[PDB]
A paper describes a structure:
Human protein [name]/[name], the founding member of the HECT-type ubiquitin ligase family, was originally identified as an associated partner of the viral oncoprotein E6 of human papillomaviruses (HPVs). The E6 oncoprotein from high-risk HPV types hijacks the ligase activity of the host [name] to ubiquitinate the tumor suppressor p5313, leading to the aberrant p53 degradation. The HECT-type E3 ligases have a characteristic C-terminal HECT domain consisting of an N-lobe and a C-lobe that are responsible for E2 binding and ubiquitin acceptance, respectively. Here, by using cryogenic electronic microscopy, we reveal that the structures of full-length [name] and [name]/E6 complex are monomer and dimer of [name]/E6 protomer, respectively.
After several rounds of 3D classification, we identified five distinct conformational states of the [name]/E6 complex and resolved the structures of these five conformations at resolutions ranging from 2.6 to 4.4 Å. We therefore assigned the five conformations into one of two classes: attached (Att) or detached (Det). In all three Att conformations, the catalytic C-lobe of [name] attaches to E6, whereas, in the two Det conformations, there are no interactions between the C-lobe and E6. We hereafter refer to the three Att conformations as Att1, Att2 and Att3 based on the distance between the tips of the two towers in a descending sequence: 74 Å in Att1, 71 Å in Att2, and 66 Å in Att3. Following the same nomenclature, the Det two conformations are referred to as [name] (76 Å) and Det2 (61 Å). As the two towers underwent an outwards rotation, the Det2 conformation transformed into the [name] conformation. Accompanying the [name]/E6 complex conformational changes, there is substantial variation in the spatial relationship between the E6 from one protomer and the catalytic C-lobe of [name] of the other protomer: far away ([name]), close (Det2), or in contact (Att). Among the five conformations, only the [name] conformation showed the docked p53 core domain as being away from the inter-protomer C-lobe; the other four conformations showed clashes between the p53 core domain and the inter-protomer C-lobe. Therefore, we used the complex model of the [name]/E6/p53 core domain, generated by docking p53 onto the [name]/E6 structure of [name], to investigate how [name]/E6 protomeric dimerization contributes to p53 ubiquitination. The Det and Att conformations of the [name]/E6 complex presented in this study should be structurally relevant to these accepting and donating processes, respectively. Unlike the N-lobe of [name], which is restricted by strong interactions with its N-terminal region, the C-lobe in the Det conformation is free to move around and accept ubiquitin from an E2; this is evident in the overlay structure of the HECT/E2–ubiquitin complex presented in Supplementary Fig. 14a.
Author numbering:
A (entry chain A), B (entry chain C): 120 to 168, 231 to 562, 570 to 831, 834 to 851, 854 to 868
C (entry chain B), D (entry chain D): 9 to 149
The structure:
Amino acid sequence: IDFKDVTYLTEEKVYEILELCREREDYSPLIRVIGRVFSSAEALVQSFRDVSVDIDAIRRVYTRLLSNEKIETAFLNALVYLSPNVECDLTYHNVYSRDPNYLNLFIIVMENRNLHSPEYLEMALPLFCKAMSKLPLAAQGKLIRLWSKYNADQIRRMMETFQQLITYKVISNEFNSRNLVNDDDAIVAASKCLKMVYYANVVGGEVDTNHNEEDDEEPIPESSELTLQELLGEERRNKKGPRVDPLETELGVKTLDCRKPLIPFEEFINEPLNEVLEMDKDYTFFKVETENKFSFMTCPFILNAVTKNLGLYYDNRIRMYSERRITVLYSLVQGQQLNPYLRLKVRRDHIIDDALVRLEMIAMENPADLKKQLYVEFEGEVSKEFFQLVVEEIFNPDIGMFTYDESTKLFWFNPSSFETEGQFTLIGIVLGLAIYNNCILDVHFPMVVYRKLMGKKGTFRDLGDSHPVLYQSLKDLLEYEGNVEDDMMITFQISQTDLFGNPMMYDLKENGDKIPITNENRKEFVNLYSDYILNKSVEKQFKAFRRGFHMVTNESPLKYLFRPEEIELLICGSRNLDFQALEETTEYDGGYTRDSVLIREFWEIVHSFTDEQKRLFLQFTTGTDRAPVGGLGKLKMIIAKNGTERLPTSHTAFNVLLLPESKEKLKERLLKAITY
Amino acid sequence: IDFKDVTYLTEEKVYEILELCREREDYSPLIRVIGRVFSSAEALVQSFRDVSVDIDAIRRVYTRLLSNEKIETAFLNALVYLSPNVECDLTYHNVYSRDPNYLNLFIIVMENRNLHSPEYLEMALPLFCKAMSKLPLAAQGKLIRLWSKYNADQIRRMMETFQQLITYKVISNEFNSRNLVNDDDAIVAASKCLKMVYYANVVGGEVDTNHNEEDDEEPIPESSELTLQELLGEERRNKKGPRVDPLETELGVKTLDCRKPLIPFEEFINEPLNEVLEMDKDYTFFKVETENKFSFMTCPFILNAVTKNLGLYYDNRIRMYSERRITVLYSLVQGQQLNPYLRLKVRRDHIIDDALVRLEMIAMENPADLKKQLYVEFEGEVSKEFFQLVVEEIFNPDIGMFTYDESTKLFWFNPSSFETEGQFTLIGIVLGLAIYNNCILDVHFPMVVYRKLMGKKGTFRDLGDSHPVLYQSLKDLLEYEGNVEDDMMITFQISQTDLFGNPMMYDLKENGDKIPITNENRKEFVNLYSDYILNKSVEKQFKAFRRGFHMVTNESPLKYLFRPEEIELLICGSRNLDFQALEETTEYDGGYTRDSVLIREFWEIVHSFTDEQKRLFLQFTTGTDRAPVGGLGKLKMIIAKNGTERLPTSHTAFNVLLLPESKEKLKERLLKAITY
Amino acid sequence: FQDPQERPRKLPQLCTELQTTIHDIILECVYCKQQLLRREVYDFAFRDLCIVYRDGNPYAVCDKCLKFYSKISEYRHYSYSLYGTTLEQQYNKPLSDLLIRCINCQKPLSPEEKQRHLDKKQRFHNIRGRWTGRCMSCSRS
Amino acid sequence: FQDPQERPRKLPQLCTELQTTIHDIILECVYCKQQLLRREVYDFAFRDLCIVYRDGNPYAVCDKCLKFYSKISEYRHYSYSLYGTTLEQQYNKPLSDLLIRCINCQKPLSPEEKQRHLDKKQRFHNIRGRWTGRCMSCSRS
Ligand SMILES: [Zn+2]
Ligand SMILES: [Zn+2]
Ligand SMILES: [Zn+2]
Ligand SMILES: [Zn+2]
């Protein structure tokens, strides 16, 4: 009668819970006894059976049950004892090799809506996640492709399951550098569980496996490095590529291929992990996997925009520390002179024409040395403000490479450039050199520019943020009803304005005059013209911009860590403004301290001004009006009290400000120097 | 009646303990109550008063008391509570500046002979030692000079007090590298307490502050280093010298000045500290004093002969690591070629004449580079066996520098060398180069040679181990009774044999023929003739040997760590022989492991032979018959299994032995190669 | 010496076509153009190093530039470092079926040398997509 | 220029006897024999550096060899390193009454710079019997 040994939670167990809710009087342990074998290892292999699971069963089974109160305490304690001795069911027994049936014990446990109660996180839930994080590759692949058919709120509350755990775990422990964060296994697990949820939103959302770019021609390395591959005979085979997550390889999908997920990617971040985690050795866990520690950079979606550069700063430094260490070795054993920097001779009249033959020399002769740290020198007379000298000199309409669109307030690659790919190389290089040296720029690019760099082309979806007056005039074709041959006089040939002013007739078809557009190939007219201005009018120019960008950040994990939205806050900076964090990120060099008066005079003169004029000040200290990406005190302020009448000595790089040993004795001339 | 508030343990308290032992019936707490205020801080300042202490009182006071049983438990618990809050009586209150009276609370507590019971070491005794280790300098100076009047057994049982504590502390804890030994404060204290006992045996034993050498002419440094002192203007003032312990400076005495202590120095060693302590960072505590850690090399007497070189090996390595790092810098910025070694070109026919112009070039041109690691090269064709090529080539009578005395079986500096100071320079240098590179030599020097190098001359006491047939013939003068003018025909002039064979008449007095010896100036005849052969017949030759020795180990703490007895086991090696430690100090290089047969074949063929022939084998693996100083496995054996018929490839430096992949297939030719 | 299939790729493939023993092969480096040392001569066979053709000239390496430039690629092009276990789960192949060379001497890492890395848990090194290790001749101190 | 008392020892003692300002003093190094740089010129006064006489020639230093050879003495002749407290108990003197220079720039260590070492518990350096520190110009990154 009691049905103990046979499979639990079935429709037979639905009638058993219904008839044991019949005659409720003194029924205290019988419901937990008739749900206890649900909390068993092999009893969910067998019960409820590209899978063999009945989702149509269980999501009505749990509904019938909730007319009581103690069963969530009864569901809990069985799973405390389930989870370790089922963790070794794949750690040691390795049962996915033995069956594809096995996954069903996760889903039935997962669909409990009273998991929303936080009483599981004492011990119960995370070790259920740990074996779920210890699943093998194709085991995770079918599991994720099972979750490619969810609704968003099913993914949302499943996302909110692990996020609430990593809400719980930061308020659990005080983490330190002897109190390491990668040795705690649950946050390793739950984020790796959330990675599958994050990779669910890839394959569950908008998919475009097709419109990738031309595969980026990885740079020819130097004559020494080419030699060694011929010495090792591996000149036949090519590189296996960058850092690649295996779930990208296991599902065969890329997150770059995802246009829109179920719920957008920026919601999938743990923020309080970031503010307590040091990526100084988490990046050491990234390039060097360790025994009892795992890298959070292999779950990059959990990090906000504040944090993913902070490891990329650490990544470039180890490529710069090594490129310091290389020319150590060349002066030692080869006797070739110590060149520990990317020195950059320029003249302010010719900095494009200076750095073109400068960089393309290093882009030809020794392609390695671009990974050395940037160091700018003028004639006569730095590197942070150097980019500002380039940016409007490159984003000038008068230099002939870009157009500004006033409504969108963003730039765009002008396709009317003739033999300007050389100057298009540098804007790629300086875009890498800004990123690689971690500097901020005042750049207004559409996101399609960042979208096209990572490896996915421009679509109809990217056309609006580029220029909507074209984009509206093609969606209005698609949002029309009429017989568009008799209604509209539009054929495949168009009129594209040269900077002479004359629009140039371009048959996007093989004969755009001879074939017209109907209702059906209205889709085909978009799929030529949406890609026309965005991808293939500027295709030789963009690849020469891509080649400039690629040979700076190819060896960087920038493609791995980042999405094209995240590049925008990474190369273009942020528009926020803090000062309470500024006054605490200042070690007392020179002698001046915070509570003495001439510290708060800078604070009060910018707080007298509005935000744009505080940024007019912070152009001098940071380098530009654009803040560092995310937070403001991530670059520290630097004070200097060294011996007045004139303007204080203030750099952009080392963030210094000279100070004489009252409040309003220098501020008029100081703001004068600011607004000069 | 009870006498509570007034000063305790006095003769009034002697009659009080006697009259409270009168009528013993039910007297359980009264003796501990009448000894409790003895266990008080300020109550021993006042009681019992270059000092103001009554030793005549207390060493009969404790005698009258011991007719009972519970008072050693009663003496204990008061001192548990005394010791921390009296540790800050000089750590914070700093009472030695306030009085010289204060020291009396240590001595009264110390003279308890029931401290020999080990029940103090739970908590009680070491913190009594800690404040005694926290005494200031001149506070320790009078305290030690108070203990310059002890008997030996009073020092012995006081030595055995702290040694039994450091017997207790090693069996207390399992010490590691995360389980540091210098952060434990009691062993820091008790050894620093034992240092005073060790420095008691200096000033309590035989003192000779007078017969120091000529002050060793510290070498002229290189032209770069001389320049910087002229750039810093400090060419006026000289160096303050080596590592110097402040108690040597506080007492004004040196341990080198001590001929014989109360009980000899070699008894003052903790052996089980040495076998658990790593000097890898204890030497880092030696050159760099730290916050919560103190260097045991500042108590060098606690270490045996096994251990004091093990830090001196680490000391030379940091002088060799830096001298590697220096020629790193010269090839970098000066562009002067990487010279990371003391390369040594020789020809086996001329190695003295090779290394004389070799070393004296570096002893003149760049005096720094002798601290670089030794590297020997012949023409045509190493550095460990190189010294063996020098030793008999220097200790030959046929090379004309030394004589061998067959009875004593030791060498001696022959004073009959004419213009041989150049060859006397090298034997100093090679003696340093053996030590600095930590190599063992087969040298038979008298201890006076090591005695004269550290800074104390040769006495009558050192004459016997040099050559007793002279030494007996002057003590027999002193152990005679007769009127030695009418009895003995001896005047101050002597007959000293040249290697021509002719004895040379030498008036040791200003006119040794004209003044004869009587009973009184028989002392004066020794004090000329004891120093004659030992110090001043060879004085120009010994200093040229000293100058050779000095400019190799001046910057080393060899003078600090070591006594002239300890140099003998340090430069001359040891005559012990282990093999069980040899077979465990062999990591399996090549492929051969221990339990396979050809490992124990070396063991069994040397264990078939007697000891001298096992040393005939170990001349090939270590370098000579002389063992490493102290233990045998301190140099590791090295096995090699790489691909036979011929003799195995076996080095002296890297201790390698080639092995083909049975037991008696190669041993005849192997022992043949050994005994060739 | 121009077409790939006619010129030999290894010194065992060369020495008969180039009419020599392993000893008296006449060769010049790619960096230093010097007569290679005889220990260096023999290893280019054993370490299975591959013949460079600069201007139709069969070049080899010298060892002191071989260990140098391998240290250059180690410092300049280092992607990640992986356990010895982590290839058999991610490349999913036996390591003796895998061409992993030495990071210093560039001899292909031995079947027992690779099992040290699973025994003593020591990590490999990935550079330029290629895999590297530490050989037993490159394990002395 | 030969007898010690007639030739001046410092540039403030020199510049009047050698008839100049602090700016237009004509000097050559001891290592490089070059016209010293003007920041370098002014510091030899302020860092109180002392005039070398090679063959009766008043020599000074250049800074890049000054910081070099001070690093040489740091690496070659290093005796022990001591807390800022540990001089006032063992030398038993005030540190402002003590000539401690910089280990890098060889300016005499400032009375506030020495109190950093008792504040932040940072250790001095003894070399050649002389004492050294780290100045505030030599504390940037
Ligand atoms: Zn070569
Ligand atoms: Zn190797
Ligand atoms: Zn100079
Ligand atoms: Zn300085």
